[PDB]
């Protein structure tokens, strides 16, 4: 259930401005298979589990 460090790579590919559409849908369905339906619930799970994800926020 804990967020893993390598899944921080999968937030970069979702935020990539010209990454393939069928790739970015797979990662959303991956994270939605573990209860995380938005990107804002992907950074809020990485937060609680000990990482820094305000390196996207303002």
């Amino acid at each position: 259930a804990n967020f893993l460090e390598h899944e921080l790579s999968y937030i970069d590919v979702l935020l990539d401005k010209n990454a393939d559409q069928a790739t970015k849908d797979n990662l959303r369905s991956y994270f939605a298979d573990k209860g995380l339906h938005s990107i804002k619930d992907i950074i809020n799970k990485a937060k609680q589990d000990g990482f820094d994800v305000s390196k996207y926020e303002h």
Partner: protein, 465 residues
């Protein structure tokens, strides 16, 4: 209640009590911590208590891929259809992949070298960080999965990531089978036991029960007697690698930082290839690095791995030595004289009797490792029977065994026969010189070593669609 910090015997704690005149633990009020294994049917007064296996019994490389569906997804790289296993996103060893990091509650790997802040690794099995030599082997198999999937991707552009992942996985599982049964088990059992317990494979048999026996979880810990007190690292001329060539084992447990920051896996693999194992002798059973200082950097007290072995057998309700002898069709010594003959050692037989009173009560691990070794093997007849019986069941009762009709084609099987562990090291590390003949026997640089280019690669032409 907390078995780690308390010496109260209340479930689920079964702490090991301390005798008078212990050479290390002077205070008899203290204990060595121990959690009883989880019961299959918790709280029952009908069932006879039994323990759980959390992994697949099959030799299926589940230590790479995981034994549970959620974990198995987590291990995969889901950012492309290349069918790869996730790799570490922060570190490399000289350009090559390291295992991704796990995210545990009480990360023991963080408590070895606090400043480095290198957490434990995530793999198909939870013990991947326990010694860096184990980690290296894990990292090797991860890389070999990625190499294969890459090569298959090239050879079959059509294939999706599922297909690439499964085909690579199926190859990796077949390599673990071949290394294990062709190269490893013969050197464990010796020729005689090998022919008796593993006769040439015929075909899959769906009536063979492929489960791990409870006793095997204890019997296969024979390998604690092979453990050397140091971790050896050697440079690219197979010389001691500075400035920590020989690290005491009690400073490598959970020391994930050593892989990441003290030179990756190459030095460690070279040291496993070019150093001897410890020999099991009757008066040199097991070293104090595991017997006195097991996990001492990450716990209130150093554990005793041999003593834990014996406590565990009692936890699991395992019959003693004579009952296992009888199971195996071996004679059962009743007196000290008879036990002497069986062990070729009346002195050891007197010391076993002084403790146990009867050979009926000798704990299976202690009994097994005490026996003299079979010609050209590293276990005696009791352990050879248990170990050999188990591996026969894993082979004959496995539907996906690599030689089973229909798993691989004849051409694929022929390609697969060319594999070997030294080749896998060539293919996935910066090492160019590796152990020859049998990697498990070869132990001396340079006489036992060859250049990589002398070893044939695995040819995947028979995987072409």
């Amino acid at each position: 209640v907390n078995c780690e910090t308390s010496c109260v015997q209340q479930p689920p704690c079964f702490p090991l009590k301390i005798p008078p005149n212990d050479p290390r633990i002077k205070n008899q009020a203290d204990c060595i911590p121990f959690f009883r294994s989880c019961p299959a049917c918790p709280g029952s007064n009908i069932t006879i208590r039994n323990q759980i296996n959390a992994l697949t019994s099959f030799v299926d490389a589940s230590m790479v891929y995981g034994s549970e569906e959620p974990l198995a997804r987590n291990l995969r790289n889901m950012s492309n259809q290349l069918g790869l296993l996730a790799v570490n996103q922060r570190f490399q060893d000289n350009g090559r992949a390291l295992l991704p990091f796990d995210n545990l509650h009480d990360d023991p790997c963080l408590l070895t070298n606090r400043s480095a802040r290198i957490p434990c690794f995530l793999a198909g099995d939870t013990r991947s960080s326990e010694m860096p030599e184990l980690t290296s082997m894990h990292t090797l198999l991860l890389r070999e999965h990625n190499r294969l999937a890459t090569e298959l991707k090239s050879l079959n552009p059509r294939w999706d990531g599922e297909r690439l992942y499964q085909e690579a996985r199926k190859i990796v599982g077949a390599m673990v089978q071949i290394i294990t049964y062709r190269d490893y088990l013969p050197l464990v059992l010796g020729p005689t036991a090998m022919r008796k317990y593993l006769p040439t494979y015929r075909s899959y048999n769906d009536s063979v029960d492929p489960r791990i026996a409870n006793v095997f979880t204890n019997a296969f810990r024979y390998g604690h007697t092979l453990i050397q007190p140091f971790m050896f690292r050697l440079d690219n001329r197979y010389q001691p690698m500075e400035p920590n060539p020989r690290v005491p084992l009690s400073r490598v447990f959970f020391a994930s930082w050593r892989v990441v920051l003290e030179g990756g896996i190459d030095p460690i693999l070279r040291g496993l290839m070019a150093t001897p194992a410890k020999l099991n002798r009757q008066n040199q059973i097991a070293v104090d690095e595991i017997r006195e200082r097991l996990f001492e950097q990450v716990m209130r007290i150093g554990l005793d791995l041999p003593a834990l072995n014996m406590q565990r057998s009692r936890d699991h309700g395992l019959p003693g030595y004579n009952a296992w002898r009888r199971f195996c069709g071996l004679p059962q010594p009743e007196t000290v004289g008879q036990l002497g003959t069986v062990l070729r050692n009346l002195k050891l037989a007197r010391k076993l009797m002084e403790q146990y009173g009867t050979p009926n009560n000798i704990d299976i691990w202690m009994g097994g490792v005490s026996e003299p070794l079979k010609r050209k093997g590293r276990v005696g007849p009791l352990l050879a029977c248990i170990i050999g019986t188990q591996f026969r069941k894993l082979r004959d009762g496995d539907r996906f065994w690599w030689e089973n009709e229909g798993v691989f084609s004849m051409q694929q099987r022929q390609a697969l026969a060319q594999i070997s562990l030294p080749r896998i090291i060539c293919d996935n590390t910066g090492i160019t010189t590796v152990s020859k003949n049998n990697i498990f026997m070869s132990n001396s640089y340079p006489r036992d070593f060859v250049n990589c280019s002398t070893l044939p690669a695995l040819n995947l032409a028979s995987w072409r669609e």
